[PDB]
């Protein structure tokens, strides 16, 4: 096919090639009817299709063709289930084929640096391994149906405030280990047809014209074979952008930037090979979509609704379950309290907003699962229409809670709190909802709180409640999934993909979010998410990877393939997980790697593997993990490559980042050695660390150290520490030759 | 006028020789012109003059002098008068030993609890540090000798202190690290300032012209000279041009030969050299005029002062069930190796050979009297054992109260290296836990120069923090333990629960000759307050044997300008039965500001003595600097118009009274807009908004977008949108260039 692609570009005029690198309208590429090049359509989004209708204004974001609204990424990621996410991706692909969409503008895979980021609900995790794995699964599913996925937003689009002008200042190592890392394996393992650049600047340059970002990292290093699309209106200098690696500008600019491409080529400022390479990347995707186009495609809207119900039920997180209040008994009286019972929160706002084909009713689904023997009572409790206080609602809700055997309060973040375009300003539930939970907990000790929200929230009442069910934004089948888990038809198996801090101010980005004067600096560096709380010793409300189950899982017999391993070697880790309870369920096994000693500062531990296993009561199965070099390597900026510092590494396997149950030690070694360059201002102790250089300076230093009667093995003496901190030039001040020192420095480097 | 006439008579070799030392402690004399040689020596909390018949490397073999409490403990007095008196006692001892310049005080900010020299620094707060440093300098120089402020600047770690590149943003320097030295220079005018060993943003402090000339000599108007740290000079000519006047110690003419060669070559102007010589000579002859021949000081009175300084700066961190003060009856058990070998000073160039030394056991027995049965048990050994623990448990159970003396051994804290952890030795922790099991009434006295973790804090009733109390520590401990002195010390630095909590933890001591202060302003309590992290004991915390009730907070004005001044008043009443001193603390909070600044910052403190039932009024004056942050754009202190809270309390976390104030400025910063400026930012300038409003109004209505909906995506897209994107939302590029011209004009 590629031989035919080159033949088509030879037949295209310069104006036709430059027009292809820009959109036709808001969602379509320009056709070339002369050569049979068709026009393809791309649209949102990550957790559901949002195709705008024909007779709709461009700003009418929600006026779209009905499609399945799946759980958003923030909740779906809590499944830790690569298979479940791929199936949701395949369902999205099926719906694209049915609606003649060639490219889905998803998934979103930006790192959750701050809990306040407005789009956290449609992102996966604060961890680059969990994010990349689930993003790769999402892409594989979408593209298994013959349509393209668009990974976004590349990169470091971690706040909505000033996202179109802010200069994001991130050091290289933090990028390689955290923000680039979230996208890296999604590109490498899933090979998405398109990657979308971000609105923001990264270290002085907009991502749409950042050649290091788009060409050096994405296209050359990671070998991205598809094309790169801009975010909508993210193009600044089109010619600079095309040379940097931005292939397709969206939306259309009505030929303004197209004429700039043609004039720059004819002027000689822009090589035509740059244009041909971008056209070739775009045409490859266009014809790959045409090749996989399914005529008269249909999907089963009811089957996708049941999938959305399963996806939500298997990603809900049981944060707390004191006295095993959940699952609810199918008897007695159950009280449902909250405005979210009738008007539930199930998705976010912005370009990802979905017009659902259906929407489950929470009260009816629970009543259906409860049965005849259950008496179901509802009380409004609080009102979303007014952020005020209404003691009549609180008093009526307390009376309903007292008469019942159990009270279930549905609370969380209203629709206005979370959206694309702006961030949250605080991390707390509306006060009228907090007053209700505390009031219900006073009169009914058996109180369950169901949280509907796209991002972490503070829970000041956490000690007054028995059960907290975190459903995130569960999609259009939230009601059924809630009924399934609350009554135990589904054993909850979701575990958090991001840290829930006690206070917003605890979070690592707090002092540097959202920045000042079109500038934000990631001064926390690597220490994002649980990496911060673990290393700082700060206890979150609920840690990364936390999630309970109606059953208990016992870990035992941790195995390792090897104990002494090299950089180019591979270790195999094994653990046996047994369901020691009475109810079947799925357990998310988590593997972390700890570097006990390293010259560079690294987090306490980093997630490097996760699997989900289903276990019947009493059943035991073995779970396996493979450990790459990348499981032990940090990014070394000097050699511009991943490096493993020789030392001991702990393989931590547990039920959460703070529930490690088994550990094993391994020793990983490297043949790579970093060469340090010394000067006349280099510390004496640093030069004596290189045995080659120590042979040159050791004897000379011995003459001065004994003449000064200084002990150098006394690690608690000032003069010993002065000799260690001394620059080499100060040694000549005792007894040497200035020129002789320069020769010794040359020999040390040689 | 006579100084300039002397410089005309000096040869070029003599001018270059004066800018470098004669030996380790003396300047070069010029006998031809009557220029004498003056001596400088350590240190901040006591005189350490090396003896004549002493080896050159024998750091501790010095003339006996009074060892006062080090700065870390002395700062907990919060008493400018007490610190100045200690400075004056230091000056008298310099005069007695013919020392013209004391190499003190040290005033570097406590960024990390692990810094090795924290024991001889004042505080983590630049206001408390600058005020007490100014008091120390005033005291020393009231006696006719010079003080040497050190170390300038940002010398906040001992690891690689001679090669590390310290990376600090401008605003953090101006508000925290420079600020610790600023008012000490301005209010006390020390004769000498010492540069630090480290690099500050790429340049050694010894040749950092922005540091020594632009900030210290030009902006702050330092009229004395600048001396290098010992061996901190790199390129002598560069340093002389940068503002480094005196290189110490001597280099035996090596750098002197570089200065003469650089002047004769024409690379270095002689006016630069003459200006440095004039700064050195001005101080030399100012010392000669104030030289007191054959001066003697009262060694006993300075010992009592060192006892008073320690007793008034010990911090009662905890006192559950009022175990302290101890009763003068029953049986009291003193446990710990620190009973016989107490920790009372640090290690390094500031180490003092004391003229006297109180014995903890004898002073306590003396203060206890006939009715007290005093029993001793060793408990633990510093040299390395359950026998010591078992004997100590029987002694604690047999007693009515047990007092354990614990802390950091001498090897832990010194100049030259930092601490690696923040806990007292484990054999001491095991002992405290064992004694707390069998004796519930347990008092822990801590001897240490820097914060320590206290995992046993819930097992003990009283914790008395004595820091490094000096040569009269034993008497001062007896004074406070039995209530002869009502303790009034309050922490000058935050005591974290865990080392990892502290702001510098992820960036200390750095890597590869580089450390970056990525926490910025948020050092000390500024970090814990804004982050909501609970310290073990907060900044400004300290208990008393009596209680003080605050009331009637008054304020001079409620609406004030940038150039105005506010006067704050508060009434403090001793509502207890015992007289005592209370440290009143004033903080300023900026409730809303465009720049990120801490939750609150200390801007005033006073200490008042109150007899039982007595009430006195405490007054504060609030400068422009009390509300201003450092604005890097205008390179000046700036006050954003808004509301400010005046917080008065007994500690940084015990605010008792508050008052609201509104501070305004007529100074307005002009922002320059481009085609890449956000629409919302351009609408912030009412002049420029008048240019863009109409054009933006057409686009907003054509798209049916509500712009008063602060929770809508499309409204937020218009706000974040660059002006160039407006053409994409329908406009003309050429009209946009004209609109940008009108906005800037
Ligand atoms: Cl990212
Ligand atoms: Cl400093």
From Swiss-Prot, chain B:
Pathway it works in: Glycan metabolism; cellulose degradation
Statement: the UniProt record of this protein carries the keyword rRNA-binding: no
Hydrolase as UniProt keyword: yes
UniProt catalytic activity: Hydrolysis of terminal, non-reducing beta-D-glucosyl residues with release of beta-D-glucose
Protein name as annotated: Thermostable beta-glucosidase B
Organism: Acetivibrio thermocellus (strain ATCC 27405 / DSM 1237 / JCM 9322 / NBRC 103400 / NCIMB 10682 / NRRL B-4536 / VPI 7372) (Clostridium thermocellum)
First-level EC class: hydrolase
Family membership noted in the UniProt record: Belongs to the glycosyl hydrolase 3 family.
SMART domains tied to this protein: Fn3_like
Classification via InterPro entries: Cellulose_deg_GH3 (IPR050288), Fn3-like (IPR026891), Glyco_hydro_3_AS (IPR019800), Glyco_hydro_3_C (IPR002772), Glyco_hydro_3_C_sf (IPR036881), Glyco_hydro_3_N (IPR001764), Glyco_hydro_3_N_sf (IPR036962), Glycoside_hydrolase_SF (IPR017853)
GO MF term list: beta-glucosidase activity
Alphabetical list of SUPFAM superfamilies matching this protein: (Trans)glycosidases, Beta-D-glucan exohydrolase, C-terminal domain
Residues annotated as the enzyme's active site: 229
């Amino acid at each position: 096919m590629a031989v035919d692609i080159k033949k088509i570009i030879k037949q295209m005029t310069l104006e036709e090639k430059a027009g292809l690198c820009s959109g036709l309208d808001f969602w379509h590429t320009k056709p070339v009817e002369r050569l049979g090049i068709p026009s393809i359509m791309m649209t949102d989004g990550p957790h559901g299709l949002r195709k705008q209708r024909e007779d709709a204004e461009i700003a009418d974001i929600n006026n779209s063709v009905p499609a399945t609204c799946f759980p958003s990424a923030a909740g779906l990621a809590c499944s830790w289930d690569r298979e479940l996410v791929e199936r949701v991706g395949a369902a999205l692909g099926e719906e694209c084929q049915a609606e003649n969409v060639s490219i889905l503008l998803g998934p979103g895979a930006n790192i959750k640096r701050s809990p306040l980021c407005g789009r956290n609900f449609e992102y996966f995790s604060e961890d680059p391994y969990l994010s990349s794995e689930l993003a790769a699964s999402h892409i594989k599913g979408v593209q298994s149906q013959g349509v393209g996925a668009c990974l976004k937003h590349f990169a470091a689009n971690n706040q909505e405030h000033r996202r179109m002008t802010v200069d994001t200042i991130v050091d290289e190592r933090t990028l390689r280990e955290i923000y680039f890392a979230s996208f890296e394996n999604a590109v490498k393992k899933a090979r998405p047809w398109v990657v979308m650049c971000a609105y923001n600047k990264l270290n002085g340059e907009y991502c749409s014209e950042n050649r290091y970002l788009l060409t050096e990292v994405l296209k050359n290093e990671w070998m991205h074979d598809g094309f790169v699309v801009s975010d909508w209106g993210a193009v600044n200098d089109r010619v600079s952008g095309l040379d940097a690696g931005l292939d397709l500008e969206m939306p259309t600019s009505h030929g303004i930037t197209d004429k700039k491409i043609v004039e720059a080529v004819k002027s000689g400022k822009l090589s035509e090979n740059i244009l041909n390479r971008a056209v070739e990347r775009i045409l490859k995707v266009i014809f790959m979509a045409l090749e996989n186009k399914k005529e008269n495609a249909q999907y089963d809207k009811d089957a996708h609704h049941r999938l959305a119900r399963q996806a939500a039920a298997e990603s809900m997180v049981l944060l707390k379950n004191e006295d095993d209040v959940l699952p609810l008994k199918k008897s007695g009286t159950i009280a449902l309290i909250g405005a979210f019972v009738k008007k539930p929160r199930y998705q976010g706002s912005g370009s990802s907003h979905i017009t659902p084909t259906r929407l489950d009713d929470i009260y009816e689904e629970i009543k259906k699962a409860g049965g005849d023997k259950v008496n179901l009572v509802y009380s409004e409790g609080y009102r979303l229409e007014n952020d005020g206080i209404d003691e009549e609602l609180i008093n009526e809700a307390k009376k309903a809670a007292s008469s019942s055997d159990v009270a279930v309060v549905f609370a969380g973040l209203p629709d206005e709190y979370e959206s694309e375009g702006f961030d949250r300003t605080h991390m707390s539930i509306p006060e009228n909802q907090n007053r209700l939970i505390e009031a219900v907990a006073e009169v009914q000790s058996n109180i369950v709180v169901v949280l509907l929200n796209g991002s972490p929230v503070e829970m000041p009442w956490i000690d007054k409640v028995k059960s907290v069910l975190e459903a995130y934004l569960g999609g259009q089948a939230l009601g059924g999934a809630l009924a399934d888990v609350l009554f135990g038809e589904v054993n909850p198996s979701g575990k958090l993909a991001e840290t829930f801090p006690v206070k917003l101010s605890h979070n690592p980005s707090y002092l540097n979010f959202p920045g000042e004067d079109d500038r934000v600096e990631y001064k926390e560096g690597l220490f994002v998410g649980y990496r911060y709380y673990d290393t700082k010793g700060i206890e979150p409300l609920f840690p990364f990877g936390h999630g309970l189950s109606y059953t208990k899982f016992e870990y035992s017999d941790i195995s390792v393939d090897k104990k002494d391993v090299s950089d180019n070697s591979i270790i195999n880790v094994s653990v046996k997980v047994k369901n020691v309870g009475k109810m079947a369920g799925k357990e998310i096994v988590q593997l972390y790697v700890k570097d006990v000693k390293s010259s560079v500062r690294r987090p306490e531990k980093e997630l490097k593997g996760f699997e989900k296993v289903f276990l019947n009561p009493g059943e035991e199965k073995t779970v396996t993990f493979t450990l790459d070099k990348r499981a032990f390597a940090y990014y070394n900026t000097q050699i511009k490559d991943w490096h493993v510092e020789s030392g001991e590494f702990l393989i931590l396997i547990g039920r959460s980042s703070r529930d490690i149950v088994l550990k094993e030690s391994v020793r990983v070694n490297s043949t790579v050695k970093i060469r340090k360059r010394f000067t006349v201002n280099s510390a004496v102790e640093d030069v004596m660390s290189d045995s080659s250089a120590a042979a040159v300076l050791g004897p000379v230093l011995k003459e001065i150290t004994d003449a000064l009667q200084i002990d150098m093995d006394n690690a608690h003496d000032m003069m010993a520490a002065n000799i260690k901190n001394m620059p080499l030039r100060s040694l000549v001040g005792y007894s040497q030759g200035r020129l002789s020192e320069e020769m010794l420095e040359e020999l040390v480097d040689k």
